[PDB]
Design an enzyme around this catalytic site. Structure first.
Site, mmCIF file in Angstrom:
data_model
loop_
_atom_site.group_PDB
_atom_site.id
_atom_site.type_symbol
_atom_site.label_atom_id
_atom_site.label_comp_id
_atom_site.label_asym_id
_atom_site.label_seq_id
_atom_site.Cartn_x
_atom_site.Cartn_y
_atom_site.Cartn_z
ATOM 1 N N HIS A 51 75.399 18.255 17.774
ATOM 2 C CA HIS A 51 76.342 17.150 17.119
ATOM 3 C C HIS A 51 75.898 15.931 18.120
ATOM 4 O O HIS A 51 75.119 16.015 19.082
ATOM 5 C CB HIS A 51 77.752 17.416 17.350
ATOM 6 C CG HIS A 51 78.096 17.220 18.732
ATOM 7 N ND1 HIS A 51 78.305 18.760 19.562
ATOM 8 C CD2 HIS A 51 78.508 16.348 19.564
ATOM 9 C CE1 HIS A 51 78.576 18.301 20.619
ATOM 10 N NE2 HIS A 51 78.821 17.168 20.799
ATOM 11 N N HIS B 247 72.505 10.736 21.568
ATOM 12 C CA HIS B 247 71.482 11.967 21.347
ATOM 13 C C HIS B 247 72.219 13.101 20.895
ATOM 14 O O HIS B 247 73.256 13.141 20.917
ATOM 15 C CB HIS B 247 70.946 12.114 22.933
ATOM 16 C CG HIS B 247 72.103 12.814 23.890
ATOM 17 N ND1 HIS B 247 73.186 11.772 24.486
ATOM 18 C CD2 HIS B 247 72.372 13.969 24.312
ATOM 19 C CE1 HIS B 247 73.734 12.736 25.217
ATOM 20 N NE2 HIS B 247 73.444 13.855 25.212
#
Length: 166
Positions: free
Chosen positions: A42, A115
């Site tokens: 995620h 990220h």
């Protein structure tokens, strides 16, 4: 009620999560670091911390006030942060909407570096190949998650989601 360990995140469509783990297995030996499970991949918007049921509600209600159009993410980037010991996937020029969403959620409660973490405990430097081809998709919503620790593994439990407009 009980305090939970909470965070807001953008999820990845199933096909892309599978592409990512195939690619990871191809270019990183098990020695390179501890791999994130496919369902746990995620992009975190805001890490909240331990959160009382009380302040969970106030964050949930304010996430509900956000009015933001959807955006497309194209994962063209990968790298490693030695100090954090992570290998990650990213976007070189992330869309304005992603930054605005993360900032609003960091404010309603180090700068934002969006990220998706692939490997944890990657203490050693390793060679970082580029991501696989065409990992591009429409973000349509964001989610409030609780993270527990069950049977040794890390588990993310979705609490609420909010559609982005488009």
């Amino acid at each position: 009620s009980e305090p939970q360990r909470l965070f807001f995140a953008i999820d990845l469509p199933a096909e892309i999560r599978e592409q990512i783990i195939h690619w990871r297995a191809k270019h990183f030996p098990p020695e390179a670091g501890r791999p994130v499970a496919a369902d746990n991949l995620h992009l975190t918007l805001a890490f909240l911390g331990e959160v009382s049921a009380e302040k969970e509600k106030a964050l949930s209600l304010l996430a509900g006030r956000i009015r933001q159009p959807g955006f497309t993410l194209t994962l063209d980037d990968a790298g490693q942060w030695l100090r954090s010991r992570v290998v990650w996937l990213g976007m070189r020029q992330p869309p304005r909407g992603l930054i605005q969403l993360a900032n609003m959620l960091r404010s309603q409660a180090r700068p934002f570096h969006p990220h998706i973490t692939l490997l944890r405990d990657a203490s050693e430097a390793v060679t970082i190949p580029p991501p696989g081809f065409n990992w591009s998709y429409a973000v349509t919503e964001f989610t409030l998650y609780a993270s527990s620790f069950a049977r040794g593994r890390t588990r993310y439990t979705p609490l609420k989601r909010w559609a982005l407009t488009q």
